[PDB]
Design a protein around this ligand. Structure first.
Ligand code: HYB
Ligand code: HYB
Lengths: 104, 104
């Protein structure tokens, strides 16, 4: 499917068997689950201390956690960062895995 | 052209006749010029007080300014926000104007 960017490009993905609405973000080097979403996952793996992410207003602490993502019939097993941010973001690391491309 | 997201999707655009490297960001609702870039423009219009942007670590103050963007043979006349952020971002408002699309 094609997102023409009239609205934020969001989609539903299953993370650790839990349907979540996520933002598809080409400006994020890496993917981040909000802490509220991490707390709602049906299953959670361990939490590994991380060394934060930087954005508009500064740096925010993160922890990483193992996840299984299912979408487009793919099964991706990877680590996602967890942080108190307003929305869960699939950045370039997972977008590349899913085959997403930006066309200009 | 197609960006496969192995690297951040950057491109050179002319803003007020000045070539600048910009990030193409589907997770940004609006476009923002860094203050360092605003200070380097060959021409600048007035500065209109704004009511900030929110991102990862909080809210940051902004001002808006009129700009002419030239790329892909298009001539876009619009307003861009200005803020002390690390990189200049073309968000969805300008990406839509340029015809950019994200394919998943
Ligand atoms: C949501 C998070 C993941 C995302 N950040 C990034 O991807 C950082 C980009 C990043 C951070 C700092 C300086 C940079 C200089 C040039 C290019 C990228 C840069 C990289 S990361 O720190 O998570 C890390 C730890 C992966 C290096 C973000 O908010 N992204 C927003 C929307 O796209 C843009 C933004 C970035 C930095 C400062 C203000 C705005
Ligand atoms: C670079 C700026 C422009 C960009 N922000 C946004 O686009 C905000 C998204 C925005 C802000 C706050 C809550 C939101 C809730 C749901 C969806 C969007 C939301 C909207 S804006 O405030 O500039 C405004 C004033 C246009 C409403 C950003 O940093 N984007 C990064 C990388 O994509 C993501 C991010 C957003 C908020 C908090 C943490 C991370």
């Amino acid at each position: 499917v094609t997102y023409n960017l009239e609205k934020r490009p969001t989609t539903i993905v299953l993370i650790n068997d839990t349907p979540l609405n996520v933002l598809l973000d080409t400006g994020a080097d890496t993917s981040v689950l909000t802490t509220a979403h991490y707390n709602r996952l049906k299953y959670r793996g361990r939490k590994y201390q991380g060394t934060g992410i930087g954005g508009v207003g500064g740096n925010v602490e993160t922890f990483s956690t193992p996840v299984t993502i299912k979408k487009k019939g793919r099964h991706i097993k990877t680590r996602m960062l967890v942080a108190d941010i307003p929305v869960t973001i699939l950045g370039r690391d997972i977008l590349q895995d899913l085959g997403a491309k930006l066309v200009l």
